[PDB]
Every structure is written in structure tokens, then in C-alpha cells.
Amino acid sequence: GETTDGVYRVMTRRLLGSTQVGVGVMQEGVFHTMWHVTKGAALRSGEGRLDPYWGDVKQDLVSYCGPWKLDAAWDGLSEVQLLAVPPGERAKNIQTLPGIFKTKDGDIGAVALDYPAGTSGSPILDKCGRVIGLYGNGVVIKNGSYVSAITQGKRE
């Protein structure tokens, strides 16, 4: 069905009404989302079907129709935009300066914006509009708010 580049909502009719479980990026004929959104299940796009191609539970990422295409990286200095797509609400860009997740295997950029779980998979962008990662996997801080990593896959 629709394969035009852009941001899309991931919906399900299995629960009550139509519920938004996540978000994803269509780029170069490949649909990119977080693993926890679909759990690797097939997706529908109108009459067409999207089948999983690559995925990893630890990275929390999954690609459909082809390999992961997103390879822009946060420069470690500039503000970024979360192109937030919340359930039942219009897509909206939010500009923020990312924090840092310090891990035993290196540092990762992190965005401190609190959105509903159904916003998981919303792309994070650089000043050129390139997707530097997806929002939706992170930690719940002492306050109760969510701080998400800037999760980026690898382009083979």
C-alpha cells in the first residue's frame, strides 16, 4: 500500500476501538519501528502487507521490507527535534537539548520529554531533518517522568 517516505502511526483493532501502540519511519521502502511496538508481527498498509526483515530485542529495533536504513548520529552538542506523534493527536516537533545515558559500553544520547507509551517509535531529528534515532526506550527517573535513549540502528 502506502510506501511514501514519512512518519506513520502503528495501530491495532485487537483491543477496544482502534488503539495506537506506536509510531515508525518509512524511508527508502523500509518501515522502521521499535521492537516492543510490534513484537516482530506483520503489519498491514491498506491492502498491502509488510513483513519483518530484521530485528533485535536488546537494541529494541525492527525493520520491515528491507534492512535498517537510518544511520545519522547525534553530534553530541546540538539541540534535536522529537517529531512526536501522540495517540489521537497531531504530529508535533519539540526541540530539546539531549542528556547522556552513561553505560559500561559507552555513552548514548537521551531525550527528557514525557509522552504516552503509544508515542514509542517517534523519530528524533538533526538540523538537516535526518533521523538520528527513535524515541521510546529508556528509564523512569525518581520523579516518575520518562527519559528515552536516542536509539539508532546500524546500516549494513
Partner: protein
């Protein structure tokens, strides 16, 4: 059965709402892809 619906273009928007802080957090990532705080 899951389905997708278009929500917009991927573009940087000048004069967008600037918010959010930049915390430095010590975290650990387990095999199930779940982050946790290290204190």
C-alpha cells in the same frame, strides 16, 4: 492485526516549542532491552 496510517513528513521545523532538560544518568541495559538506573 496491526496496520499503519501516515502522520506527516519528517522535517526540522524552525521556531518549534523548545523544552526538556539534559540529565546525565548512569544506566545499565539488560538482555531483554530494558534500561535500569545504576545508583
Amino acid at each position: 492485526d496491526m496496520y499503519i496510517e501516515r502522520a506527516g513528513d519528517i522535517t526540522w521545523e524552525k521556531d518549534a516549542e523548545v523544552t526538556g532538560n539534559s540529565p546525565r544518568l548512569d544506566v545499565a541495559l539488560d538482555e531483554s532491552g530494558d534500561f535500569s538506573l545504576v545508583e
